[PDB]
Amino acid sequence: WTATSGSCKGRCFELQEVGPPDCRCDNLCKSYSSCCHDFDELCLKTARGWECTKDRCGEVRNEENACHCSEDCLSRGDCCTNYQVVCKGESHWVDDDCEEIKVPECPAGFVRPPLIIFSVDGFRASYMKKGSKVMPNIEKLRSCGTHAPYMRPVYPTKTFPNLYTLATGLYPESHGIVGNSMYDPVFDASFHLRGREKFNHRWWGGQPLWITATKQGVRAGTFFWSVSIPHERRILTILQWLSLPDNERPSVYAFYSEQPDFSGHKYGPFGPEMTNPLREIDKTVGQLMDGLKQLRLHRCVNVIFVGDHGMEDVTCDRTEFLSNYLTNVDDITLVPGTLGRIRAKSINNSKYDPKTIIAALTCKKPDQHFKPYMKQHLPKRLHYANNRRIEDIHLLVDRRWHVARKPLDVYKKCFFQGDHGFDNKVNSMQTVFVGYGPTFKYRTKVPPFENIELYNVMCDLLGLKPAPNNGTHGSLNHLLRTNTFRPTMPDEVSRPNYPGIMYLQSEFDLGCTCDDKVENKLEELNKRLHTKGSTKERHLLYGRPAVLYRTSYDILYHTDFESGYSEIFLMPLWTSYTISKQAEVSSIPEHLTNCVRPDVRVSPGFSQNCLAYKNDKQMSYGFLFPPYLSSSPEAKYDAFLVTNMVPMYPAFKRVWAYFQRVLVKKYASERNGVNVISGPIFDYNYDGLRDTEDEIKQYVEGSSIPVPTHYYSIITSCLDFTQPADKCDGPLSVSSFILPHRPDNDESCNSSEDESKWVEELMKMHTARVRDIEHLTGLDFYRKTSRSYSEILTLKTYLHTYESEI
Numbered sequence: 001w002t003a004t005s006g007s008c009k010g011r012c013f014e015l016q017e018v019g020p021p022d023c024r025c026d027n028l029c030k031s032y033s034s035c036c037h038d039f040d041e042l043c044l045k046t047a048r049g050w051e052c053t054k055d056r057c058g059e060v061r062n063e064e065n066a067c068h069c070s071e072d073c074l075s076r077g078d079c080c081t082n083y084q085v086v087c088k089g090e091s092h093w094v095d096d097d098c099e100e101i102k103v104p105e106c107p108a109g110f111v112r113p114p115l116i117i118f119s120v121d122g123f124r125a126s127y128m129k130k131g132s133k134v135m136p137n138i139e140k141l142r143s144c145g146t147h148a149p150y151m152r153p154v155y156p157t158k159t160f161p162n163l164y165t166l167a168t169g170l171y172p173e174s175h176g177i178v179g180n181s182m183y184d185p186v187f188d189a190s191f192h193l194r195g196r197e198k199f200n201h202r203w204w205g206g207q208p209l210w211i212t213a214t215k216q217g218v219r220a221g222t223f224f225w226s227v228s229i230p231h232e233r234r235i236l237t238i239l240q241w242l243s244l245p246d247n248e249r250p251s252v253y254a255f256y257s258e259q260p261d262f263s264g265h266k267y268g269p270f271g272p273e274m275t276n277p278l279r280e281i282d283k284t285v286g287q288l289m290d291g292l293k294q295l296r297l298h299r300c301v302n303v304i305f306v307g308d309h310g311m312e313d314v315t316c317d318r319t320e321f322l323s324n325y326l327t328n329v330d331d332i333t334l335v336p337g338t339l340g341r342i343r344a345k346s347i348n349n350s351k352y353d354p355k356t357i358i359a360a361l362t363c364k365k366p367d368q369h370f371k372p373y374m375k376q377h378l379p380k381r382l383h384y385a386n387n388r389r390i391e392d393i394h395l396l397v398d399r400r401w402h403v404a405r406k407p408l409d410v411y412k413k414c415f416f417q418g419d420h421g422f423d424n425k426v427n428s429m430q431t432v433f434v435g436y437g438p439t440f441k442y443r444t445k446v447p448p449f450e451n452i453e454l455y456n457v458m459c460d461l462l463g464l465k466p467a468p469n470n471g472t473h474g475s476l477n478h479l480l481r482t483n484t485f486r487p488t489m490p491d492e493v494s495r496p497n498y499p500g501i502m503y504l505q506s507e508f509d510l511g512c513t514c515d516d517k518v519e520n521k522l523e524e525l526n527k528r529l530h531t532k533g534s535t536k537e538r539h540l541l542y543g544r545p546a547v548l549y550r551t552s553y554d555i556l557y558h559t560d561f562e563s564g565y566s567e568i569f570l571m572p573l574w575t576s577y578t579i580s581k582q583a584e585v586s587s588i589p590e591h592l593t594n595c596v597r598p599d600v601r602v603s604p605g606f607s608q609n610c611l612a613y614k615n616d617k618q619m620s621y622g623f624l625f626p627p628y629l630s631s632s633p634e635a636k637y638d639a640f641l642v643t644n645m646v647p648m649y650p651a652f653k654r655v656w657a658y659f660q661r662v663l664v665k666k667y668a669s670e671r672n673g674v675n676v677i678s679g680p681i682f683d684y685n686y687d688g689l690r691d692t693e694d695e696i697k698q699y700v701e702g703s704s705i706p707v708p709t710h711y712y713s714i715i716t717s718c719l720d721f722t723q724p725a726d727k728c729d730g731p732l733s734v735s736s737f738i739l740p741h742r743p744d745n746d747e748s749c750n751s752s753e754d755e756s757k758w759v760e761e762l763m764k765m766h767t768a769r770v771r772d773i774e775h776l777t778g779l780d781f782y783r784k785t786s787r788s789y790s791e792i793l794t795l796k797t798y799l800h801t802y803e804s805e806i
């Protein structure tokens with residue numbers, strides 16, 4: 001109940017919310033059915049429109065008008081945005097030349113440059129180039145400020161997950177808004193676009209920017225706008241708030257436009273009906289900048305122009321129906337569309353079985369336009385698993401398609417021509433970022449970056465300490481003229497041991513054999529040097545990774561590779577080696593096919609054993625440094641050490657062997673040498689974070705050898721590829737992946753074919769940021785480069801996406 005008898009007189013768009021049953025006048029009362037009776041009359045005035053005309057100049061203040069052109073309006077802070085242009089001879093902001101904003105030029109009593117976030121729904125990255133002719137205000141922001149060619153949204157590329165990711169710096173799995181539609185089984189409650197459940201605070205985790213600001217004494221404009229409040233009114237309200245006395249004036253503001261998303265759904269991303277929505281957004285930008293100009297704020301405010309996600313061409317005829325795959329279609333609930341999420345329709349049905357549903361959905365039709373996954377097998381770069389609201393079964397839908405349960409759902413729910421929500425690496429889903437103002441750089445292009453990084457920068461812009469989030473603070477320092485955040489490298493927690501030769505071959509009873517008993521001061525003094533680290537500068541180019549957790553591990557040196565060997569997990573945490581452009585690939589000699597060799601630096605008790613692999617009928621083994629890339633026949637023996645061995649399913653060995661035998665040398669040819677760091681990842685609770693030993697769900701049978709969930713590699717070279725990887729004087733270039741260590745290749749529908757037709761495609765799907773590997777391993781890479789730490793943080797957030805040009 002709200003007793004709507006009170007009045008909004010002098011309360012229009014009040015900044016503090018009043019609690020029921022008192023009537024509300026805030027920009028959200030409409031959405032709650034709670035506004036005072038006189039809200040429309042007083043707060044939503046429209047009389048005479050939004051623009052001054054010549055004859056309105058100097059008029060007598062008529063309070064009925066939507067905005068004013070009288071002499072007193074500047075002092076009242078409620079002129080039409082084009083007032084000084086029509087009436088005082090001024091130019092529109094867009095018509096003025098860019099001039100660098102070296103320092104904030106603010107009115108007295110401004111403690112800090114305000115931040116205005118101008119968010120646009122469905123604003124696809126290529127609109128910046130493709131609509132540039134019809135968006136002069138936006139093009140001026142873009143060319144004069146700091147801009148990225150595009151900004152990567154989070155998965156799923158839906159509105160609520162992305163706007164809340166912008167506000168919090170968190171992945172959807174951590175903030176809790178994991179789609180536009182959700183079921184939480186603990187609450188037994190459902191979140192929907194339409195309705196009241198979505199307003200309950202228990203959905204919204206983390207700490208959004210307006211709360212961070214509030215708690216640290218920085219006042220915030222309310223971020224949310226009821227749909228019926230016209231854009232012109234929203235702009236005028238922000239500008240009015242900017243005229244409040246110092247003690248009352250917010251420092252952070254948000255504007256939101258439903259466009260171009262609204263029209264994009266109806267007409268597709270480039271339908272000819274899309275030009276008008278883009279003109280109109282630009283006009284709104286123009287009104288804001290003209291209004292800031294009148295208030296002398298246009299060289300004071302930091303403005304961020306940011307989208308939530310792009311838009312793709314999607315029509316009703318491109319829909320896949322689960323009813324063409326499943327017999328049991330009515331025993332499932334599907335969340336449908338540009339992603340799929342499946343759970344049992346009833347928790348009382350014990351005939352429901354996720355494994356048979358997945359199998360019925362796997363590679364069933366030649367051109368199938370979705371792929372099923374258990375959520376823990378989705379590409380780790382999506383970070384889409386660790387939340388009870390994400391169903392165990394997930395469908396990744398191809399761009400341009402929908403999935404639905406039955407045909408009746410489509411024709412009894414073509415209307416739409418555009419949609420979004422697909423994998424966040426898809427070009428059509430990319431969106432925009434422009435930063436303009438005293439704190440941003442002047443005329444500066446920055447590389448694409450992820451929207452999870454913005455919360456930190458928005459905190460930097462407002463002098464706030466960010467709550468804990470998934471951005472990497474410092475990775476976007478290059479966007480900023482000042483207010484940079486200068487982090488220190490994390491402290492190493494465990495120091496390595498450097499074992500020498502301490503065991504005799506006969507102390508080992510590992511059930512391993514090697515044909516290696518074939519026999520020199522020349523070549524013995526030499527191999528001693530290699531085991532002491534003589535070639536270490538070649539294979540460890542950026543210093544050793546730091547171990548950021550408490551553990552016991554050994555550094556092992558070799559001619560061709562260096563490793564950090566975990567005495568706890570019985571295998572390396574990391575293995576580092578450099579492959580020059582000139583390197584040669586060899587085969588594993590016939591005599592060495594099953595050769596595994598005890599490592600005399602490492603106790604039998606801290607070693608794997610070959611018997612466990614013999615007994616484990618499902619599990620085989622691979623090597624981290626590949627024997628194919630050995631520098632010489634004698635060096636090859638090092639690759640067969642038991643301390644370079646890791647457990648691998650035979651299905652996975654197909655992937656791994658092709659990566660090591662074919663792809664590494666291919667990358668070395670293309671990039672002028674590469675440095676490779678590979679290792680295992682254990683993430684059995686799919687939380688994106690390193691497992692402790694007591695979290696491991698699977699061991700090689702009969703042993704304490706833990707089975708990795710994933711294998712990673714980080715492949716680094718010189719950004720200037722005219723310099724070889726091992727003699728690089730400047731910026732680095734990186735690509736990484738985190739491959740699921742699976743007992744089958746069901747994910748790859750063409751895997752019966754030769755590895756040259758399917759392996760690289762799989763690896764590309766599992767592309768990753770170094771930072772994702774850091775979380776998963778508790779390691780910290782690139783500790784010793786000649787590069788600034790912020791540049792390295794940027795490199796660690798880089799994702800190689802394999803999409804064509806935007």
Ligand SMILES: *[C@@H]1O[C@H](CO)[C@@H](O[C@@H]2O[C@H](CO)[C@@H](O[C@@H]3O[C@H](CO[C@H]4O[C@H](CO)[C@@H](O)[C@H](O[C@H]5O[C@H](CO)[C@@H](O)[C@H](O)[C@@H]5O[C@H]5O[C@H](CO)[C@@H](O)[C@H](O)[C@@H]5O)[C@@H]4O)[C@@H](O)[C@H](O[C@H]4O[C@H](CO)[C@@H](O)[C@H](O)[C@@H]4O[C@H]4O[C@H](CO)[C@@H](O)[C@H](O)[C@@H]4O)[C@@H]3O)[C@H](O)[C@H]2NC(C)=O)[C@H](O)[C@H]1NC(C)=O
Nearest residue numbers: 173174175176204205206386387388468469470687688775
């Ligand atoms: C991305 O960045 C984010 C933010 O930094 C990272 O997430 C953090 O990770 C931390 C480590 O996992 C985690 O810390 C835990 O917090 C527990 C208390 O958490 C509450 O309070 C905080 C602070 O205000 C709050 O943010 C939390 O909010 C979560 O939960 C509510 C719903 O309950 C949601 O509304 C909200 O969206 C958020 O959900 C997300 O996180 C939770 C986990 O907390 C997931 O379950 C959800 O799926 C969702 O993803 C909470 O309200 C604290 O209790 C934990 O302590 C346990 O472990 C420590 C080890 O230090 C130990 O000392 C304790 O004994 C304790 O163990 C006990 O509990 C066990 C399980 O119940 C039990 O087995 C034991 O026997 C013990 O009884 C722990 O410190 C932190 O909460 C989240 N923060 C957020 C916002 O998600 C994230 O990791 C980053 N991702 C990547 C890939 O880097």
Ligand SMILES: CC(C)Oc1cc(C(=O)N2C[C@@H]3[C@H]4CN(C(=O)c5ccc6[nH]nnc6c5)C[C@H]4[C@@H]3C2)nc2cc(C(F)(F)F)ccc12
Nearest residue numbers: 117118119121159163164166167223224225254255256261
């Ligand atoms: C959700 C809420 C907690 O957060 C925010 C809410 C709002 C804010 O006020 N809104 C109003 C609209 C709500 C309803 N809605 C839809 O109707 C919708 C839109 C597009 C669709 N495509 N497909 N289905 C769709 C459904 C999504 C939400 C849109 C954001 N603005 C925000 C602006 C920012 C800004 F500007 F800072 F980025 C940050 C957060 C914001």
Ligand SMILES: [Ca+2]
Nearest residue numbers: 121122159308
């Ligand atoms: Ca949206």
Ligand SMILES: [Ca+2]
Nearest residue numbers: 683689690691
């Ligand atoms: Ca984990």
Ligand SMILES: [Cl-]
Nearest residue numbers: 178179180181
């Ligand atoms: Cl959804």
Ligand SMILES: [K+]
Nearest residue numbers: 613616619620
């Ligand atoms: K085996």
Ligand code: NA
Nearest residue numbers: 745746748751
């Ligand atoms: Na297959």
Ligand SMILES: [Zn+2]
Nearest residue numbers: 122261265420
């Ligand atoms: Zn949309």
